[PDB]
């Protein structure tokens, strides 16, 4: 009759049940604290990060989407309501081509303009007209090239000094500059920079042009024709200089100066006689007068190749090990179900 | 008689509670791993994200707050220490207005300057002086317009050829350009672009001006006056051209050339005679010389209205199902309390 | 291009060019507008996008003073 032992064994079992309940209560409190941390503080922090990211993205996307408007505003602010040329943000290439197509000219002029869009842009400009709300109103002013493919020639001169018993007579042509033949007259541009060369095409400025008779051509055959009063300036004191020509140079050497043809690296090639002399770009590379050295062509120097630094991604995603949690959770669930089945079996077996 | 059955039931019961405790300890290990993961590996990532966001914000805010300084630096770097005008970042509008109010001139001049701020800016400029530490030092040079509201007139000419037995005699005026009346003399500007027109006001350049006698205006009444040597150039060969006027054009037609006014949609409106004829910008639209067609006015073309793409927010806040978890936790606490109370009842009953 | 030396007057002429002369002006009118930008109400105080928008509006207000819009 050892029933007293089982009368205390169940009491110890009940005490163990109470201890397990206290332990699981402490576990529940810890779980509650962790859940209150993660659901409130971490979620608030990540929401704040999301809001800041959205703000940054809106700022950069605003810049990217309004790039053209921002660029035109920046240029007008820089130049105080004007732009020196038609920039690529003032007018796109398709718009420029359409505008050139709609111009009141002929097919050849339209084709040449579509070839020399760059000169079109650099001879046009844009002006700021007003601001309405969040808008800017401006007008682009495109040039219309109605005259194309007529002869043009450029004139350069140097003093022409002749010595007689120490008495000089220097003659200099004053016709220097650009000439382009037009209808009814020839247009004369006294300054070289008045017309700009692109390939074989010469784009001249209307404001600087001077209309002269077609008979100005005879100045290039006989400088003293009675048909046309060629404009020359006379002198008495010698002048020594080098006048650069598009395919060469004119060098005048008189009185006490020492002019000579040279080629840089090696140096002197030949001394030059007194008077006027014409040297081509293929003959030499420099002209020296006294101690002054003039270049004939551009001195081609170094060539550089610079590449920008690389940019790389820094995306390192974080992956959660779900499997090791799932196996343990299935283990605890199956343990709980087995415990329920065992207590049910105990209740069933207790009765006869 | 069933004490053996009671013993067996107790043994199965304690086996069940031991299995439940083992499950509880496995769950405790799982939640320990979850807590350590959340506390270390996720908090480190969120701190790194916070640091990166702070860096991005600092860069953007630097760009936004130092915008005027950066724009001035950019402009001076682009033009190498010079700026072609007084930009809106060199000098704000309030500073420009204060400086205009402080100039040593009169109220009318000051008022006209505050009206023509744009010409003030475009005729001024700024130069770079030096760099000290993290600072840029520059000077802004403003124009002082002390003479206002005096008569100004512009003169344009075309060749004037006459024929005698086929021998021509052409005359051209060289007084072309801008004139403005001043004290003691008249200022003459030979080039049209020497003075810039805004409304009815002409802003002229001091460097290009040439002071000339007040008696130069008699060239506009009789060129052959002995009271003034009007600047004319004679010729012998004919010249055909069209000189564009502010409100019209001068067209000269001579010798073997054919000139006529017309439009851009229809051809000939009228054939012009030989000599100079003056055509206003309302009479026609174009002038044709031989095959060359000159426009009288600006050809107003298309009008465009372009709007940028919209910008939208991508903020999607996250949220947790708090109510279900709280209900489950309260149920856990109430169930464990009920189990403790009822096991206490059983222990008290066992006596 | 062909260049000739003119010995009688110490000059040169370079021929072979082709003219392109302007005879008129052709104009167009453009209107550029800022696209729509929405509220971001989640932020606190100085939003970066709102600062950008205020900067753009102030720049537009300054630009209005240099227009031909009398």
């Amino acid at each position, epitope marked *: 009759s050892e029933v007293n032992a089982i009368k205390g064994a169940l009491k110890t079992t009940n005490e163990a049940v109470s201890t397990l309940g206290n332990g699981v209560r402490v576990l529940a409190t810890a779980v509650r604290e962790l859940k209150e941390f993660v659901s409130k503080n971490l979620t608030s922090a990540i929401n704040k990060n999301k809001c800041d990211i959205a703000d940054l993205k809106m700022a950069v996307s605003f810049s990217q989407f309004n790039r053209r408007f921002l660029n035109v505003v920046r240029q007008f602010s820089d130049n105080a309501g004007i732009t020196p040329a038609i920039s690529l943000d003032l007018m796109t290439d398709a718009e420029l081509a359409r505008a050139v197509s709609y111009m009141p000219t002929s097919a050849g002029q339209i084709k040449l303009m579509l070839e020399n869009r760059a000169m079109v842009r650099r001879k046009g400009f844009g002006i700021l007209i007003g601001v*309405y709300g969040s808008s800017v*109103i401006y007008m682009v002013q495109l040039p219309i090239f109605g005259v194309i493919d007529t002869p043009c020639w450029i004139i350069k001169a140097a003093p022409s000094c002749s010595e007689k018993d120490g008495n000089y007579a220097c003659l200099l042509r004053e016709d220097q500059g650009w000439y382009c033949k037009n209808a009814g007259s020839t247009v004369y541009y006294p300054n070289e920079k008045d017309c700009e060369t692109r390939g074989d095409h010469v784009f001249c400025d209307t404001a600087a042009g001077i209309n002269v008779a077609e008979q100005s051509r005879e100045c290039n055959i006989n400088i003293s024709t009675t048909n046309y009063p060629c404009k020359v300036s006379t002198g008495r004191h010698p002048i020594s200089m080098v006048a650069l020509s598009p395919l060469g140079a004119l060098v005048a050497c008189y009185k006490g100066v020492s002019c000579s043809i040279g080629s840089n690296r090696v140096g002197i090639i030949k001394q030059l006689p007194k008077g006027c002399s014409y040297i081509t770009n293929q003959d030499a590379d420099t002209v020296t007068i006294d101690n002054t050295v003039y270049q004939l062509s551009k001195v081609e120097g170094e060539q550089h190749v610079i590449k920008g630094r690389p940019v790389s991604s820094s995306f390192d995603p974080i992956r959660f090990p779900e499997d090791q949690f799932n196996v343990a959770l299935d283990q605890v669930f199956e343990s709980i179900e087995n415990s329920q089945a065992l207590v049910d079996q105990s209740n069933k077996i207790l009765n006869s | 008689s069933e004490v053996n059955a009671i013993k067996g039931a107790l043994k199965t019961t304690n086996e069940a509670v031991s299995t439940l405790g083992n499950g509880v300890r496995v769950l405790a290990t799982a939640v320990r791993e979850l807590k350590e993961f959340v506390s270390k590996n996720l908090t480190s990532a969120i701190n790194k994200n916070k640091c990166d966001i702070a860096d991005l914000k600092m860069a953007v805010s630097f760009s936004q707050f130092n915008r005027r300084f950066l724009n001035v630096v950019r402009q001076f770097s682009d033009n190498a220490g010079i700026t072609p005008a007084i930009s809106l970042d060199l000098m704000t509008d309030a500073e420009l207005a204060r400086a205009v109010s402080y100039m040593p001139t009169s109220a009318g001049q000051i008022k006209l300057m505050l009206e023509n701020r744009a010409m003030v800016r475009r005729k001024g400029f700024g130069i770079l002086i030096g760099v000290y530490g993290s600072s840029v030092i520059y000077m802004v040079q403003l124009p002082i317009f002390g003479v206002i509201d005096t008569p100004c007139w512009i003169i344009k000419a075309a060749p004037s050829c006459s024929e005698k037995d086929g021998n021509y005699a052409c005359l051209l005026r060289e007084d072309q350009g801008w004139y403005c009346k001043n004290a003691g003399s008249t200022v003459y500007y030979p080039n049209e672009k020497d003075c810039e027109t805004r409304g009815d006001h002409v802003f002229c350049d001091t460097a290009a001006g040439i002071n000339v006698a007040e008696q130069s205006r008699e060239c506009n009444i009789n060129i052959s006056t002995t009271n003034y040597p009007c600047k004319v150039s004679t010729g012998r060969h004919p010249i055909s051209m069209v000189a564009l006027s502010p409100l019209g054009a001068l067209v000269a037609c001579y010798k073997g050339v054919s000139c006529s006014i017309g*439009s851009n949609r229809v051809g000939i409106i009228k054939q012009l005679p030989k000599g100079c004829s003056y055509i206003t910008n*309302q009479d026609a639209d174009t002038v044709t010389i031989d095959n060359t067609v000159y426009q009288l006015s*600006k050809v*107003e073309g298309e*009008q465009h209205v372009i709007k940028g793409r919209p910008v939208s927010s991508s903020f999607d806040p996250i949220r947790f199902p708090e109510d279900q978890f709280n209900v489950a936790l309260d149920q856990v606490f109430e169930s464990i309390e009920n189990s403790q109370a009822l096991v206490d009842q059983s222990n008290k009953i066992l006596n | 291009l062909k260049e000739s030396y003119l010995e009688e007057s110490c000059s040169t002429i370079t021929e072979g060019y082709l003219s392109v002369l302007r005879t008129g002006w052709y104009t167009n*009118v453009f209107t550029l507008e800022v696209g729509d930008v929405e509220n971001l109400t989640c932020t606190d105080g100085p939003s970066l996008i709102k600062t950008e928008l205020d900067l753009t509006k102030s720049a537009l207000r300054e630009l209005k003073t240099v227009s031909a819009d*009398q």
Partner: antibody
Amino acid sequence: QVQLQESGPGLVKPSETLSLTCTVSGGSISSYYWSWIRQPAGKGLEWIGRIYTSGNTNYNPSLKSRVTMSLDTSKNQVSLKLSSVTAADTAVYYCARSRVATTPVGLRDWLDPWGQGTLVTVSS
Amino acid sequence: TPSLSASVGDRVTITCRASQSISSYLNWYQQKPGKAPKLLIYAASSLQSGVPSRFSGSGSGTDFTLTISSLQPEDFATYYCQQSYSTPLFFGQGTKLEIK
């Protein structure tokens, strides 16, 4: 969208200096071109003139010596002034937008939209 | 002005002719009594946005035609053709539609 409205005296004495105003809202008067059209009672439409962004004008040759048009960007208005009005100048006056845009055939221009108009009566 | 009488659902063809060829520089307008003209057709073949599709434009050069396929009681108005070839802008004399 751009909408327009006309305002004026309504009754003008002979040989006076009739003035009308069209007020543009929803857009800017510099972004487009503008026109005036008048239609007498029981008669057809007569085009009067057009004004551009730059301020240039082209007038009907039957009214060019008596019509002045202008833009005022501060109030966003288009002004019309007809001097020396007689009884033959009585009509309903409309302001409208000149739209110049690309079409499948090229550059074409029309008048859209229109204003509701206003009646002007000339009598002694 | 020349008038036209037609019934509901009937096909109406309005024709106006230019002095010279103007390609496709022609417009159509619909004006109702007491209102302002409303553009219907531009460039002689383009249907203005908001206009019912029953209105059509055709022709090039000198002969242009406005056609309405299925007439409605709201279609009764006055129609003018205006040429955009050259200024001065000129409007057609107008064809008043009246009910039968």
